[PDB]
Amino acid sequence: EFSKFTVKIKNKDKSGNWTDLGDLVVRKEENGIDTGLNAGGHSATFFSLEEEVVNNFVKVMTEGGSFKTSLYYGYKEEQSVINGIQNKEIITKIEKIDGTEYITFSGDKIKNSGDKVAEYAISLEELKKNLK
Amino acid sequence: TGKCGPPPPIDNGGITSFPLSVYAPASSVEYQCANLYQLEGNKRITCRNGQWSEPPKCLHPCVISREIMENYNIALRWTAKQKLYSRTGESVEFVCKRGYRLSSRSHTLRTTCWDGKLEYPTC
């Protein structure tokens, strides 16, 4: 019934380097979108958003810009991961990495460091492929 | 003075090196946890005054098994994987199987593994 697709994703690691993280599943819902992160023994909502912002998202996720999340969780070292946080903006920039061009976005800050947010990238071609 | 003997053992872990029978003050060794265990604490202990600094700890993972997903009437929301091994600090999220609905006892479907204990929702 609903448009589903999944895509691959990376986070910069403990030394600020990029690294295969796992899968980002992206599911269309009656109320907007839920994205889920499959990454080892972690498979749980990564973040989600409301119908209002879908359109924006679809653009942002294929040309950068920003959009507000209904719920943002992120991934295992982020502060936001266990409880979730609301209305977290998310700014995507297009940035080249190795031979390929990627959508990148900062995640939440990290426990228990100071000023060390997380970062993610997703292949612009896998995104453009799916969100046309 | 003030040399240490072998580094202490830790449940579900090991050192990365071969144990000397004696260490010089200020020497380090380093611990690794078993496959799915999460090391908590500094990984590297240091010898001083005849004593080893505090060792780390290996946090247990949680086995999400087909059997238990049955009893609770649930299934993994994001993978088709029928079983899952989750490391402390890792979130899992379920759904009900077609037919059941979320028991009054549960309010959320998204849990996190903490040190071998993971709170399942009931459907």
From Swiss-Prot, chain B:
> Per the entry's comment, what about the domains?
Sushi 1-3 domain represents the minimal unit capable of cofactor activity. The property to discriminate self surfaces from non-self surfaces depends on the C-terminal region made of Sushis 19-20.
Q: How is it modified after translation?
A: Sulfated on tyrosine residues.
Q: What is the effect of changing K83A?
A: About 50% loss of C3b binding
What does this protein do, in the record's words? Glycoprotein that plays an essential role in maintaining a well-balanced immune response by modulating complement activation. Acts as a soluble inhibitor of complement, where its binding to self markers such as glycan structures prevents complement activation and amplification on cell surfaces. Accelerates the decay of the complement alternative pathway (AP) C3 convertase C3bBb, thus preventing local formation of more C3b, the central player of the complement amplification loop. As a cofactor of the serine protease factor I, CFH also regulates proteolytic degradation of already-deposited C3b. (Microbial infection) In the mosquito midgut, binds to the surface of parasite P.falciparum gametocytes and protects the parasite from alternative complement pathway-mediated elimination.
Top-level lineage group: Eukaryota
Q: What tissue specificity does the UniProt entry give?
A: Expressed in the retinal pigment epithelium (at protein level). CFH is one of the most abundant complement components in blood where the liver is the major source of CFH protein in vivo. in addition, CFH is secreted by additional cell types including monocytes, fibroblasts, or endothelial cells.
Outcome, altering R105C: In CFHD and ARMD4; rare penetrant mutation that confers high risk of age-related macular degeneration
Subunit and interaction comment: Homodimer. Also forms homooligomers. Interacts with complement protein C3b; this interaction inhibits complement activation. Interacts with complement protein C3d. Interacts with CR3/ITGAM; this interaction mediates adhesion of neutrophils to pathogens leading to pathogen clearance. Interacts with complement factor I.
Pathology noted in the record is:
Basal laminar drusen: Drusen are extracellular deposits that accumulate below the retinal pigment epithelium on Bruch membrane. Basal laminar drusen refers to an early adult-onset drusen phenotype that shows a pattern of uniform small, slightly raised yellow subretinal nodules randomly scattered in the macula. In later stages, these drusen often become more numerous, with clustered groups of drusen scattered throughout the retina. In time these small basal laminar drusen may expand and ultimately lead to a serous pigment epithelial detachment of the macula that may result in vision loss. Complement factor H deficiency: A disorder that can manifest as several different phenotypes, including asymptomatic, recurrent bacterial infections, and renal failure. Laboratory features usually include decreased serum levels of factor H, complement component C3, and a decrease in other terminal complement components, indicating activation of the alternative complement pathway. It is associated with a number of renal diseases with variable clinical presentation and progression, including membranoproliferative glomerulonephritis and atypical hemolytic uremic syndrome.
Name the species this protein comes from.
Answer: Homo sapiens
* Annotated Sushi domain residues: 2-60, 65-123
Q: Give the intrachain disulfide bonds.
A: C4-C47, C33-C58, C62-C113, C96-C123
| Consequence of substituting E93A | In AHUS1; about 30% loss of C3b binding
Please report the name of this protein according to its UniProt entry.
Complement factor H
Location comes to:
Secreted
**Residues of the whole record sequence present:** 1106 to 1228 of 1231
> Result of mutating W78L?
In AHUS1; about 40% loss of C3b binding
